[PDB]
Design a protein around this ligand. Structure first.
Ligand SMILES: *[C@@H]1O[C@H](CO)[C@@H](O[C@@H]2O[C@H](CO)[C@@H](O)[C@H](O)[C@H]2NC(C)=O)[C@H](O)[C@H]1NC(C)=O
Ligand SMILES: *[C@@H]1O[C@H](CO)[C@@H](O[C@@H]2O[C@H](CO)[C@@H](O)[C@H](O)[C@H]2NC(C)=O)[C@H](O)[C@H]1NC(C)=O
Ligand SMILES: *[C@@H]1O[C@H](CO)[C@@H](O[C@@H]2O[C@H](CO)[C@@H](O)[C@H](O)[C@H]2NC(C)=O)[C@H](O)[C@H]1NC(C)=O
Ligand SMILES: *[C@@H]1O[C@H](CO)[C@@H](O[C@@H]2O[C@H](CO)[C@@H](O)[C@H](O)[C@H]2NC(C)=O)[C@H](O)[C@H]1NC(C)=O
Ligand SMILES: *[C@@H]1O[C@H](CO)[C@@H](O[C@@H]2O[C@H](CO)[C@@H](O)[C@H](O)[C@H]2NC(C)=O)[C@H](O)[C@H]1NC(C)=O
Ligand SMILES: *[C@@H]1O[C@H](CO)[C@@H](O[C@@H]2O[C@H](CO)[C@@H](O)[C@H](O)[C@H]2NC(C)=O)[C@H](O)[C@H]1NC(C)=O
Ligand SMILES: *[C@@H]1O[C@H](CO)[C@@H](O[C@@H]2O[C@H](CO)[C@@H](O)[C@H](O)[C@H]2NC(C)=O)[C@H](O)[C@H]1NC(C)=O
Ligand SMILES: *[C@@H]1O[C@H](CO)[C@@H](O[C@@H]2O[C@H](CO)[C@@H](O)[C@H](O)[C@H]2NC(C)=O)[C@H](O)[C@H]1NC(C)=O
Ligand SMILES: *[C@@H]1O[C@H](CO)[C@@H](O)[C@H](O)[C@H]1NC(C)=O
Ligand SMILES: *[C@@H]1O[C@H](CO)[C@@H](O)[C@H](O)[C@H]1NC(C)=O
Ligand SMILES: *[C@@H]1O[C@H](CO)[C@@H](O)[C@H](O)[C@H]1NC(C)=O
Ligand SMILES: *[C@@H]1O[C@H](CO)[C@@H](O)[C@H](O)[C@H]1NC(C)=O
Ligand SMILES: *[C@@H]1O[C@H](CO)[C@@H](O)[C@H](O)[C@H]1NC(C)=O
Ligand SMILES: *[C@@H]1O[C@H](CO)[C@@H](O)[C@H](O)[C@H]1NC(C)=O
Ligand SMILES: *[C@@H]1O[C@H](CO)[C@@H](O)[C@H](O)[C@H]1NC(C)=O
Ligand SMILES: *[C@@H]1O[C@H](CO)[C@@H](O)[C@H](O)[C@H]1NC(C)=O
Ligand SMILES: *[C@@H]1O[C@H](CO)[C@@H](O)[C@H](O)[C@H]1NC(C)=O
Lengths: 564, 564, 564
C-alpha cells in the first residue's frame, strides 16, 4: 500500500538496434585507413540467467562488413596506375621456352608510350589466356585485345599493398553492446541460453573464397548445418567442420618479372619469361581425411531428410567465377575445378588432386567494384590452408535421393559464417518502478539477468560506459550521437527534479491501472528487462506526470520564498 | 520595495542571426546526396501578439540556397563522361530528311577513339546550330568546332539523373527558429503583424527560368509588386500573380538517339535522325487570359507612378541567355523569344504563340559552374507549366509614359520570390529579472508575445528544443555548436549556484540604476523580448555580481562546515 | 588531526602532451584554406614563480607544422594545369638577343595540342639550363627532354596564388595551453624560469631557405648558439643573431612572358624573349657588417671549444639543393653560391657579392611533394631580406683548428628556430586534498605557481576555459574531444555526490599512508602542481573510496525516506 514512482539511472536493460560498428585492428589495407590499431585485449563477461533470440539471416553486422570491405578494398586502388595506355592492338603467338610450349599463356607484342610522348616503343609480355579476347571473327588471326577494354579501365594494385587477411575486430560505440551465444549447436536462429557480453568480436579474417571456406574459425564439438529453411531449394547451406582438412596449392613454374614504361612516372609489371620445367597449377587434399569428412557431414545432413539417401555432384557450369573454387595466394588469383572432390554417395557406415587456371584481370565482387590487375609475383608460389567449411545447394528427378552441389559468391555468406554467434543492442539506461518513498516537500551490463534489487547495487557501472572520408566521418558521427543521448538523459532528470542523482524519489503516486504486482513480487522475483517489457506501453504516460509535478512544485517553492 | 535578481532558463526570446539551415526532402540530385529524406509533417504555430521587421533583400536564406544549389548541381556532374575526346576537327553539311531540310541543325562527321586505342572510327551526329562555331575566316567552308573547346572541357549528364524540380524544405537546427509572415500584401519589407513559427519551410521548387517564373507558389488575394526602391531604375521588380496563366511548350519533331564509343567504358549520346514531319519548337499562351493578366498587373503597377501611363516592350537584346525566356523541359533546354508577349499599353479599362531554339551545351549559372552537355531525349516532348510571376525592369525619352522590359538571370531573384515571407532567428534562453525572493543562507517558442508571468508557466518547452563532403561536415558542425551552446548555459547556471534548476533565486539586490518600473508593471504589463531589449546594455554587469556572490557564499559555507 | 578528503575543480595544474594545434591568421595558401582569419590580439600573462623544463629537439609543434605546411602547400597545386602534354621531343639551340648570347638559357622548340585535338602547332620557349636533360649519348645533338618526364608529371602553380610568407599563429584548443620562456640565453634545453602563458604564438613566418635564415625573429640581447650535443659532429648548429645583416638579391634582366595553348581551357606560361642588356642574377651583403657578424659569432662559438681556433669553409659539394643557398623571391626560385661568404679564420680581436642560378622545376621538400613548375614573372625582380641566423656543421685532420661549413634542408630546423621558446600542456582540472570538513549526514592558468590557498580563490577561471578535408575534420575532432573531457569530469563529480559544485566535502577520512604533512604545511607552504606530483601514485586509490561511499550514502538515504 501507498506506492509512489521512482526513477533509476544505469538500469541494465536494452533494445534491438542497428548502428555503425568501428573497425579495430591488432598491432595491409584494413590497418592503414578503415581500422584503428587498438590491440583489443580479451574482456568477455558471462551473463548469469538471461535468454535472447538471435538470427544469423538478419544480422546487420554482415551487411555492414560487406559495405566496409567493398568500400575499403576499392579505395585501396585509388593511388595506383591506370592501364588505359595498354588498351592497344595486341599481336600474339604461342608462348615457348626451349623446354616446351605453355598452353595456358600467349606471347603478345604491342606499342607503349614513354615519358617522351612523341616516340613509341615495341615491347612484349606473356599473358594468361582467360584475360585475352579475339578482336574480329573475319579470319583465324594473331590479333587480340585486353578483356576489360570494352567495359572499364583497370587499375594495377600498387606492389607495396598486400592482400593477406589480417584479423579484424568489430566493436560497439558508447551506449551499445555486443552479445554472444556460447551454446553448442546453436542452429543459427532461435532462443539461446548461456549468453556473454564482449566489447569487441574475436578476429574475423576477411578471407574471400567461393565453394570451400578457407582459414575460418572451427566448429566447437560437432558438425553444424545452417540455412534459413532447409526445405527451400533456393537457400544456401553453410556447413561448419569440427576436424579440419588441409589444402596445399601451388604455381610450380618459375616466372620472371619485367617492368614496362607507360608514360611519365607510371610503370606496368608483367610476366617476361618462364625459367625451365613446366607443369600446371594444382592443389592436393588427403583422400582418406576428405572421405571421412564427406561421410561425417553426411550423417548430420541425413537428420533433416531422414529416410532419403544423399549424393554429391559438380557445380552448375558456365562462367569460372561461380562454377569453380576461387581464392588468392601470394597475391596471385587461383580458380580450381572441384569435380574430383564433390563426387560420392552415402547411406551408412593417397591424395585427391585438383587442377587450376590463373587470372590477372579480376572483378572483385559482383560488378560493384573497379577491375583490378593483379601484378605477377616472381618465382614459385605455395599456400597452406585449412578447409573450415562448405557452401552447398540442393537440387524432382528422384524420390530416394537428394543431390547436393557447390555454390556461393554472394560474399555475405562467408562473413555470416564467422558472425553467426553475435547480436548488437542499445543500452536504455532510464527506467521507472514502484517504491515506498515520499519526496520531502562488475562489467558493461554485468547484472542484467538478476533480481531487480541486486542490480540497484551496481547502477554506476552501466552509467560510466555511456560516455567516452567515411572512415573519419563515421567516428565523429558515432561520438556526437553518444554525447547527445547522454545529454537528453541528464536533461530529463533535470526537468523531473533529480538534477544529477542516480536513484530519485518523487510525489507521483503509483496507479494500479499500470500494474498490480506485490512490492516483493516486483523487487525480489523479477529481472529488469522483464519489468521494462511489462511497463513498456504505459511509459510515455508517466513522464508527463513527472514534468507537471516538478513545475507545480517549483512554483509552490518560488511563492513560499517571499514569506519564509 | 526589496527586489533581488532572479535567473530564468527557457525564456521565449530571440536575436537576428545567420547559420546554415539543413536541406530536407519529402519521401533526383537533391534527395540522393545533399538533402535528407525526412518527410517533414506540417507543424506551424501562430504567435498571439508579436511583431517583427522582415526584409526580403537581405535574407541570408537566399544566398545559402544559391550556394547549396550551385554546389550540389555542379557535384552531380562529377561521376560522368568528359567529352575531351570529342574536341575534334568536325566536318559538316546541311541536315536533311526525305521530307525536307532542317535549318536549326547541321549534320557533322568526325573521328572517334575505341577501347582499342590504335584504331579510329569515322562517325556522324546532328548538332543544333547554336553549339557549333566556324574554325577559320579564310573561306566559306565545311569545317567547324564545338563551342566549349576553347574554354572548358564539358561533362555529359549521366542519363540516370533527372532535373525535374522536387520540392525542397529548409529546416532550423536546434537553438534556432524560422518565423513566417501571414499578412496579406506584405510588400517584401518593413513591420509585420500576425507572425507564425514553423520548424521547416513549405516546399520550394528549385525551378530555373529567366523572364517568367514557372510553377511558383501563387499570390494569396491580390497582385503583389516588390523591389528595394521602385524609383531606382537599376533594381529588378518581382510581380506575383493571383490567377495563373498556363503555358504549353513542345518539341514537335521526333528525334532518334545513337550511342557513340569514346574510349574505354565511356559513351556519348547524340541525335541520329529525324523521323518524318518537321516544325519549329514553340509554345502557346491563351491570349485573353494573358491580356487580362497584363492589364491587372497594370492597375497595381500604376499606384507607384500615379499620373503616368505604362507600356511593355522587348528585352535588352544581344546574347540569348539574357534576352530570351530560358527553361528546362523533359531534360532538353529551351530558349524562347518573348517579343509577342510583352507588347502593349495601359491607361484604363485565340492563342499567342512563341517560337524557340534548343541548345545542348549550357553554362548553368553565370560562369560559376562546369559546362554541361544535355543529352538528347527521344521522341516528341511536351511540358505544361503555370506562369506564377514576372521579372521586370523600367527604363528619359518621355514624361507621360513608363516603359517596362523583361530582365533576370541573377538566379537569386527566383529563390527570393519563394522566400519573401521568412526570417531566421537564434533563441537566447537565459535572462534576468527583478523579484521579491531571498536565497536561504505548447510549441517551440509558443508564448513569445505574452505577459512575462504567463511565459514563466511554460519554460520547459523552450528548454527541450535546445538539444537533439560539405553535406556531411555542415551537419556535424551544426550539431556540435548546438551542444557547445547548451553546455555554456548549464556551466553559467553552475557558477551562479543554480546547478541545474529552471527558476532560481539569489542574494544580489536589484539596483534602480538599471530600471525603476513597478513589480506589476514588469510582470503583468510587458512581454519578455521587450524586457530583454530594455535591460540589454546593463546585462554584462549583472553576471559579474552573480559569480563573485556565489564564490563568497561557497567560502562562507566551507568555513562553517568545520564548526557546524 | 581529523582530516578528510575534499575534491576541487578548476585547480591550476597540468601535464605534458601532444594534440593538433589550430592555425590562425592576422587580418595566400594559408589564409585561404588551412588557417582561420581571427586577428588574434596579444593576451600574454606572466606566471609568478613556476619553473618548467623545455626541450627544442623534442617539441611536437615543429613536426606538426612541417606536416601542416607540406600538406597545405601540396594541396594548393590540386586545381592547376598538369604539364603532361609538354613531355615532348624538345629541339633546342643557343639563346640570343641582338645584344648577345645568354649562357644560362637554351631556346627550345616543340609541338603543342590545341582545343582542336586533330591539329598540332609548332611553338617555342626559352628554358633555364638546369631544368633540361639531353636525350641520348649517341652524338652531340640538339635533342632534349624536360627533367621531370622520367619520374613525375609536374603541375604549374596557378598565377592567382602567391608564396609570400604571411605570419602564421598557432593556438591551443580548449583544455590545453601554450607556455613560453622569457629567459635570456635559454640554450634551447633544460630548466627555465620566468615563464608566461599565451593563448597563441607570435607570428611565425613559414619562410623556406637552406643555409641562411631569412626574415626570422631576432635574438634578444646576445648571440645564441643551439644544438642537441655540440661534441657530436652529426648535429646541426643553429646560430641566432642580435644585430641583422641585410641581403639584396636580383634578376637584373627583363624577361617577356608568353602563353601557350595546351589542350582545352588549360594554358602554359613560359619565357619568350629578353629585352636588352644581360647580366647574371646576383646578391650583395655589406662586407664590414658581415665580417663583424662572423667575428661576433666566433667569440661565442669559441666558449664551447675554449682553447681551439675556428675557421669557416664551403658546403659539402654535389647537387645544388644542399650545396647552395636556396630561397624564393617574387615567385622565382633562386639558388646562390656561398663560397665568398663563409671564408675566414678567428683567434682574437665594400660589398661581398654572390652569383646565382634560377630554376623553374622544383621538388618542394625532400621528395615528399609534387614537382612544381614556377611560372616566370615579367620584368626585373628584387628582394630585400634580413639574415637572422646561420645553419652550420663541424667536420680529424687537426688539433688546433675547428672547421665549420653551411648545411641544412631538413626543413624542420628553420621552424625549430622560431619555436625554440614554446611548450604545449594539458590542463587537468580535478584534484584531491586534505581538509578539516565533514559532509552533513585573472587568466587561463594565472595562479599556477602560488600557495594552494590563494589558488582556491580563483577556481572559476580555470573552469570556464575548459569549454568553447583535414582542415575541417581536425577542428571537429578537437572540439568533440574537448566536450567529452568536460562531460567525464562532471560525471565523476556526480558519482561522488558533488553534482555540479566547485568545492566539495566528503565523509572519506584522510589516510597517513598517503601523506603526513601538517595542515598549514600543505595549505600555506606548497604550490598545487607540487602537491599533485606528490599525491600522484596514490590517486587511483582515492576515487574507489569516493564511489563506494556515495553508493552507501544513497542507499542509507533511500531506506530512511520510507520512515522519515
Ligand atoms: C615472346 O616473344 C618475344 C618477341 O618475339 C621473344 O623475344 C625474342 O626471343 C628471340 C629468341 O631467339 C630473340 O632472338 C629476340 O631478339 C627476342 N626479341 C626481343 C624483342 O627481345 C620471347 O623469347 C618470347 N618468349 C616466350 C616465352 O615465348
Ligand atoms: C520454407 O519453405 C517451404 C517450401 O520449401 C514453405 O512452405 C510452402 O511449401 C509449399 C510446397 O513447396 C508451397 O506450395 C507454399 O507456397 C510454401 N509457402 C510459402 C509461404 O512459401 C515455407 O513457407 C518456408 N518457411 C517460411 C518461414 O516461410
Ligand atoms: C493569422 O494567420 C493565421 C495562420 O497562422 C491565419 O489562420 C488561418 O485562418 C483561416 C480562416 O481565416 C483558416 O481557414 C486556416 O485554417 C488558418 N490556418 C492557416 C495555417 O492558414 C489567420 O486567419 C490570420 N489572422 C489574421 C487576423 O490575420
Ligand atoms: C547525316 O550525314 C550522314 C553521313 O553522310 C548520312 O548518312 C548516310 O546516308 C546515306 C543516305 O542515302 C547513306 O547512303 C549512307 O550510307 C549514310 N552514311 C552512313 C555513314 O551511315 C545521314 O543520312 C545524314 N542525316 C541527315 C538527317 O542529314
Ligand atoms: C531610392 O532611389 C532614389 C533615386 O532613384 C535615391 O534618392 C536620390 O535620388 C536623386 C535623383 O535621382 C539622386 O540625385 C540622389 O543621389 C539619390 N540619393 C542616393 C543616396 O542615391 C534614394 O536614396 C534611394 N533609396 C535609398 C533607401 O537609398
Ligand atoms: C619576465 O618576463 C616578463 C614578460 O612576461 C618581462 O616583462 C617585460 O618587462 C619589460 C621591462 O623590463 C617591459 O618593458 C615589458 O613591457 C614587459 N612585458 C613584456 C611582454 O615584455 C620581465 O621583464 C621578465 N622579468 C625577469 C626578472 O626576467
Ligand atoms: C628562339 O627561337 C625562335 C625560333 O627560331 C626565334 O624566333 C624567330 O626569330 C627570327 C628572328 O629573325 C624570326 O625571323 C622568326 O620568324 C622567329 N620565329 C618564330 C616562330 O617566331 C627567337 O627569336 C629565338 N629567341 C631567342 C632569344 O633566342
Ligand atoms: C654527445 O656526444 C658524445 C660524443 O660526441 C657522446 O659520448 C661518447 O663519446 C665517445 C667518443 O666519441 C664515444 O666513444 C661514445 O660511444 C659516446 N657515447 C654515446 C652513448 O654515444 C654522448 O653520449 C652524447 N650525449 C648524449 C646525451 O648521448
Ligand atoms: C534450425 O534450422 C532449421 C532450418 O530448416 C529451422 O527450420 C529451425 O527453425 C532451426 N531451429 C531449430 C531450433 O531447429
Ligand atoms: C568416399 O566418400 C563418398 C561419399 O560418401 C563415398 O561414395 C565413397 O564410397 C567413399 N570411399 C571411397 C574409397 O571413395
Ligand atoms: C489512474 O489510471 C486511470 C486509467 O488510466 C486514470 O483514469 C486515473 O485518472 C489515474 N489516476 C490518477 C490519480 O490520475
Ligand atoms: C514597399 O515597397 C516600396 C518600394 O519602392 C518601398 O519604398 C516601401 O518602403 C515598402 N513598404 C511599404 C510599407 O510601403
Ligand atoms: C492587350 O493588353 C495590352 C496591354 O494593356 C493592350 O495594349 C491591348 O489593347 C490589349 N488588348 C488587345 C486585344 O491586344
Ligand atoms: C548601483 O548602481 C550604481 C551605478 O552603476 C553603482 O555606483 C552602485 O555601486 C550600485 N549599487 C551597488 C549596491 O553596488
Ligand atoms: C646547452 O647546450 C649544450 C649543447 O652541447 C648542452 O650540452 C647543454 O646541456 C645545454 N644546457 C646548458 C644549461 O648548458
Ligand atoms: C673577416 O672575417 C674573417 C673571419 O674571422 C677573418 O678571417 C678576416 O681576417 C676578416 N677581415 C677581412 C678584412 O677579411
Ligand atoms: C590506510 O592505508 C593502509 C595502507 O594502504 C590500509 O591498509 C588501510 O586500510 C587504510 N585505512 C583505511 C581506513 O582503510
Amino acid at each position: 500500500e501507498n506506492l509512489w514512482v521512482t526513477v533509476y539511472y544505469g538500469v541494465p536493460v536494452w533494445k534491438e538496434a542497428k548502428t555503425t560498428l568501428f573497425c579495430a585492428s591488432d598491432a595491409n589495407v584494413w590497418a592503414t585507413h578503415a581500422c584503428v590499431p587498438t590491440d583489443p585485449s580479451p574482456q568477455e563477461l558471462v551473463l548469469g540467467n538471461v535468454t535472447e533470440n538471435f538470427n544469423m539471416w538478419k544480422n546487420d553486422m554482415v551487411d555492414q562488413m560487406h559495405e566496409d570491405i567493398i568500400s575499403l578494398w576499392d579505395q585501396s586502388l585509388k593511388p595506383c596506375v591506370k592501364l588505359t595506355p595498354l588498351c592497344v592492338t595486341l599481336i600474339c603467338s604461342d608462348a615457348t621456352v626451349k623446354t616446351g610450349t605453355v598452353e595456358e599463356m600467349k606471347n603478345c607484342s604491342f606499342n607503349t608510350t614513354t615519358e617522351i610522348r612523341d616516340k613509341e616503343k615495341k615491347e612484349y609480355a606473356l599473358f594468361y589466356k582467360p584475360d585475352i579476347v579475339p578482336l574480329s571473327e573475319t579470319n583465324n588471326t594473331s590479333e587480340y585485345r585486353l578483356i576489360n577494354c570494352n567495359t572499364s579501365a583497370c587499375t594495377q594494385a600498387c606492389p607495396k599493398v598486400t592482400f593477406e587477411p589480417i584479423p579484424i575486430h568489430y566493436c560497439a560505440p558508447a551506449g551499445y553492446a555486443i552479445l554472444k551465444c556460447n551454446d553448442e549447436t546453436f542452429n543459427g536462429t532461435g532462443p539461446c541460453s548461456n549468453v556473454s557480453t564482449v566489447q569487441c568480436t574475436h578476429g574475423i579474417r576477411p578471407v574471400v573464397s567461393t565453394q570451400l571456406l578457407l582459414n575460418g574459425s572451427l566448429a566447437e564439438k560437432e558438425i553444424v548445418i545452417r540455412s534459413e529453411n532447409l526445405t527451400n531449394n533456393a537457400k544456401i547451406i553453410i556447413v561448419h567442420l569440427h576436424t579440419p582438412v588441409e589444402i596445399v596449392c601451388t604455381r610450380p613454374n618459375n616466372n620472371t618479372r619485367k617492368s614496362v614504361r607507360i608514360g611519365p612516372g607510371q610503370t606496368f609489371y608483367a610476366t617476361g619469361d618462364i625459367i625451365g620445367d613446366i607443369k600446371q597449377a594444382h592443389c592436393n587434399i588427403s583422400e582418406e581425411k576428405w572421405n571421412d569428412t564427406l561421410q561425417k557431414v553426411g550423417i548430420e545432413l541425413q537428420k533433416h531428410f531422414p529416410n532419403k539417401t544423399i549424393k554429391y555432384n559438380q557445380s552448375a557450369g558456365g562462367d569460372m567465377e561461380i562454377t569453380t573454387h576461387s581464392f588468392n595466394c601470394g597475391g596471385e588469383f587461383f580458380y580450381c575445378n572441384t569435380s574430383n572432390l564433390f563426387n560420392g554417395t552415402y547411406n551408412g557406415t593417397s591424395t585427391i588432386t585438383l587442377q587450376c587456371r590463373i587470372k590477372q584481370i579480376i572483378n572483385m565482387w559482383q560488378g560493384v567494384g573497379r577491375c583490378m590487375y593483379a601484378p605477377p609475383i616472381a618465382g614459385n608460389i605455395t599456400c597452406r590452408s585449412n578447409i573450415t567449411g562448405l557452401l552447398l545447394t540442393r537440387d524432382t528427378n528422384s524420390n530416394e535421393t537428394e543431390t547436393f552441389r557447390p555454390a556461393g559468391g554472394d560474399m555475405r555468406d562467408n562473413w555470416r559464417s564467422e558472425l553467426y554467434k553475435y547480436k548488437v543492442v542499445k543500452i536504455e539506461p532510464l527506467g521507472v518502478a514502484p517504491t515506498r518513498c515520499k519526496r520531502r516537500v562488475l562489467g558493461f551490463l554485468g547484472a542484467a539477468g538478476s533480481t531487480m534489487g541486486a542490480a540497484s547495487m551496481t547502477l554506476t557501472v552501466q552509467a560510466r560506459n555511456l560516455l567516452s572520408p567515411v572512415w573519419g566521418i563515421k567516428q565523429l558521427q558515432a561520438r556526437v550521437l553518444a554525447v547527445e543521448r547522454y545529454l537528453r538523459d541528464q536533461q530529463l532528470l533535470g526537468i523531473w527534479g533529480c538534477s544529477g542523482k542516480l536513484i530519485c524519489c518523487t510525489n507521483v503516486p503509483w496507479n494500479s491501472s499500470w500494474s498490480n504486482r506485490n512490492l516483493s513480487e516486483i523487487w525480489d522475483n523479477m529481472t529488469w528487462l522483464q519489468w521494462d517489457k511489462e511497463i513498456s506501453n504505459y511509459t510515455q504516460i508517466i513522464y508527463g506526470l513527472l514534468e507537471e509535478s516538478q513545475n507545480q512544485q517549483e512554483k509552490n517553492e518560488q511563492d513560499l520564498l517571499a514569506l519564509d
